[PDB]
Structures are given as structure tokens and as C-alpha cells.
A = this chain, B = another copy of it.
């Protein structure tokens, strides 16, 4: 291969999770099975929750690194270039010898704005705990895990905890986790991290009707001292920490809503960033809603700050 540069100790924010090639087509009308139609436009975009958050971290001004699986090939080359175009360190990518780099096909109806999605296959193995054990952690000041292969990720999280017990308080690595998909295996992740993000979608699937209901009803699952965070689209976001005080920020809707895809990852990355800079939970919550609301007014990530 090649070489990478010196990363100062304790300098980077790491996001672990999915990166995917999304091929997004805008169409006149939903295509009938077995038809051949011409789209209005097509775009290839780098997507994935962890992947989107690393783009936002870089544009906020943080050194950031992505860890996730790819296979050699033209899909990965496209994704790697797109990561580097957004200033993201890809040295910790876990290259796989079996499977395909994830690629999804997203069909957007120009009539009604409906999205029809053929999601990537699951041929590529996820980063494992044994792959994680081989990573020197000292260059990272924060590690964010997108909940995916949870039993493996639990071991990574226990590895980080084991690291932090030996560290003086200023070399402790802060940890966050996101539980974004309503899948039962992910729920054990609530019990790890200093910050846990839970999605509106998961909260609803668990029967909660508001962010307030979700935080009060799930706080019992987090580890002692942790902050639980739940954004609720246009209703803004709440956070709840050990002091029992429910914090809220309203949303900051833009003049016109252009593109809400990735708004959730923008919020997550901006809360992480604000907390990593030493701000209070209430300040981070507000900043996260402001950056996410700005993003919803813009196509993609350009111009978000």
C-alpha cells in the first residue's frame, strides 16, 4: 500500500459504522416492473450514518476518522475519494476480501417526492471486535459508534472502557453510541457510552409518542452518569442526564426545506462536536438543532457552517 501521517495523540473524533454508495435517481413516474425509463437526474452520493457524521465533523473543523468495512473495487475508490474530498481520515477502514462494498439504489418520484429504495446487500462483514482490538486508541479523543453488529460492538465498547480505566481524566476517551434502527439486538447498546442517541423511529417503535416520553421511559437503560439524547425532527430535540432534568431545544427550520436527508447525522455530529469542545449539554443540544436546521435548507452538506 503506502503510508499515513502522524496524528497528534488525543486529537481525532472517530465514527464507526456504515458507509454506502447511494445511486439516487429522480424520475417522472415510478417505473413499472420490466420497463426501461430515462431519469430526470442521477447522483452518486456517499451515505451511511457514521459516514455522514464524519463529513459534518470535518466541516465543523474537527480532525475526524471513519472506521467501517469496504471491499477493494471501484465502489470503494469512489467512496474513499469522496471521504478525502470532505477531509476525512480513512486509515482505519477495515478492508475485506469477501463481499461487496454496500451500494443502494434510491428512486425519487418527481411527482409526489416519494422514495423507493433497493437497499445494499449484506455480503460485506461488519468490523469485528477482533479487528477493533488491533487499533491503537490514543490518537482519538472521542469515539462514536453507530449501532449495527451490537454483540461485537459491545466488546469494542468494553475495550474502550478498559483503556479509560488506566487513563488520567484528561486522556479519557469520550464515547457515544447511536441506536437508530428499531432492531432488538441494538437495545443492549443503551447501556454503553457517555452519550446515547436514540432515534424518533426507535422511540415510536417502542410506543413512545414524544421525545419527553422516550427519554423518561428509556433513561433507566443507560449507564450511570450517561446523557440520553432524542431528536424529534421539526419538534427539535431533548436530552436527559443524571440530574434528572429534561433539557429541550426547539428546531431552527430554514426559510425553505430543501433536503432533510442526513439531518439526523448532522445533529448527532454537531452535538458530539459541541460536547467535545467542552460545552454544556444544553448548549450542545441547541447547537445540534441549529446546524441540522440549517442543513435542511441546503442540498447535501455544502454551506452547513
Contact partner of A34 (CB less than 8 A), chosen from B31, B75, B116, B123, is B116
- Also in contact, A35 and B117, with CB within 8 A (given A43-B100, A74-B77, A123-B41): yes
Contact present for B74 and A38 (CB under 8 Å): no
Q: Check A42 for interface membership: any CB of B closer than 8 A.
A: yes
State the copy count for this chain: 2
Contact present for B38 and A119 (CB under 8 Å): yes
Binds B, one of A50-58, A102-110, A206-214: A102-110
Contact present for A119 and B23 (CB under 8 Å): no
Q: Kindly list chain B residues whose C-beta atoms are within 8 Å of the C-beta of A107.
A: 105, 118
Chain A residues proximal to chain B, CB less than 8 Å: 23, 25, 27, 30-44, 74-75, 77-78, 100, 102-103, 105, 107, 109, 114-123
Contact partner of A41 (CB less than 8 A), chosen from B34, B41, B74, B121, is B121
The complex places the Cα of A193 from the Cα of B30 at a distance, in Å, of 37
The complex places the Cα of A102 from the Cα of B39 at a distance, in Å, of 10
Most chain B CB neighbours (cut-off 10 Å) among A31, A103, A107, A116? A116
Q: Kindly list chain B residues whose C-beta atoms are within 8 Å of the C-beta of A116.
A: 31-36
